[PDB]
């Protein structure tokens, strides 16, 4: 097989959705990311994920 | 003295403004984190295919 470097060839996450309009709001010490396009709301900690 | 158009007199509002808007018709698209296909492909081997 043709060898490729591991770091740029694998991807333990997969691009699942591309949201044009993802509103982000802060409430209750958490971030709500709401997309009307896919009708989906996610909740995250206020801190960025390294 | 003379006749006057209504708009010529400032009007004070005796009505309480209750603004009620309907909820937007919202369409829920088929959204799946993993399709039955992705899930079938997630298997490292398929006995059927093999």
Q: Which residues contact A33 (CB under 8 A, 6 or more apart)?
A: A22, A23, A24, A41, A42, A43, A44
Q: Which residues contact A20 (CB under 8 A, 6 or more apart)?
A: A37
Asked if B33 and A36 come within 8 Å (Cβ–Cβ), the reply is no
Q: Containing H/E element for A33? A: strand A30-35
Shortest Cα distance, chain A CAs vs residue B17, angstroms = 29
Method: cryo-EM
CA–CA separation, B43 and A40 (whole Å): 28
Q: Containing H/E element for A42? A: strand A40-45
Query: Residue B42 phi/psi, 5° resolution?
Result: -60, -30
**What resolution does the deposited structure have, in angstroms?**
3.3
Residue A38 with chain B: CB contacts under 8 Å: 29, 31
Q: Does A19 touch chain B (CB under 8 A)?
A: no
Cα nearest neighbour of B28 on chain A: A39
């Amino acid at each position: 097989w043709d060898w490729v470097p591991k770091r740029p060839s694998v991807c333990t996450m997969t691009k699942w959705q591309e949201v044009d309009e993802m509103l982000r709001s802060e409430y209750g010490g958490s971030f709500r990311f709401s997309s009307d396009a896919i009708s989906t709301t996610f909740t995250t900690n206020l801190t960025e994920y390294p | 003295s003379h006749q006057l158009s209504r708009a010529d007199i400032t009007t004070v509002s005796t009505f309480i403004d209750l603004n009620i808007t309907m909820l937007e018709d919202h369409e829920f698209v088929p959204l799946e984190v993993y399709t039955r296909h992705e899930i079938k492909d997630s298997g490292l081997l398929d006995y059927t295919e093999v």
